[PDB]
Every structure is written in C-alpha cells, then in structure tokens.
C-alpha cells in the first residue's frame, strides 16, 4: 500500500510538470479556438 501510494503521488506530481514543460500538450483546445478565430477573421476581412 505504501509503495503504491508513493508511486501514485509521484506520478500525479510529475504530470503537472509534464503539462507545463511541454508546449504542444494543450494543442487540441487551442487548435479549435484558433481555427474558429481564423474563420471569423476571414469572414470579417471579406468586407473589403
């Protein structure tokens, strides 16, 4: 039990640093946000 708890705590602590250091981890949400923003920008630019 103690070893498993230590392993779980270590993994939970490490995943925070894994998310922070890696820049492309959060891509799948920034992707759709940027896609919608780009579509809106292309729409508004069509006025001129």
């Amino acid at each position: 039990q103690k070893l498993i708890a230590n392993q779980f705590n270590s993994a939970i602590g490490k995943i925070q640093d894994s998310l922070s250091s890696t820049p492309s981890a959060l891509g799948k949400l920034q992707d759709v946000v940027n896609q919608n923003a780009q579509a809106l920008n292309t729409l508004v630019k069509q006025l001129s």
Binding site: N41, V44, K45, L47, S48
Partner: protein, 48 residues
C-alpha cells in the same frame, strides 16, 4: 463635440456610426486615425 453618446460622425475623409469616447492609446504626431484587426476603424484623433 459630443462624447459618451451614440452619434453619427463625419471626420476628415472618413464616415461612420458609433459611440465615441476618450481613450488612452496615444498617437504619434504623424498619425491621423487608428485601426485594428480586419482593417476596421476603431480610433480617430480629434482634428480640433
């Protein structure tokens, strides 16, 4: 001069509708009127 009220404006060569108020994004001496994304007018300096 009219401020903080939905009015129609006709400045030097540019015409549009919308409320106009004092802001903080100061202009350089050569500048005449500001702009933002999609080439839409959103800031005009007072000729007076």
């Amino acid at each position: 001069l009219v401020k903080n009220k939905c009015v129609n404006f006709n400045f030097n060569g540019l015409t549009g509708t919308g409320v106009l108020t004092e802001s903080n994004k100061k202009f350089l001496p050569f500048q005449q009127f500001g702009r933002d994304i999609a080439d839409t007018t959103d800031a005009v300096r007072d000729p007076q």
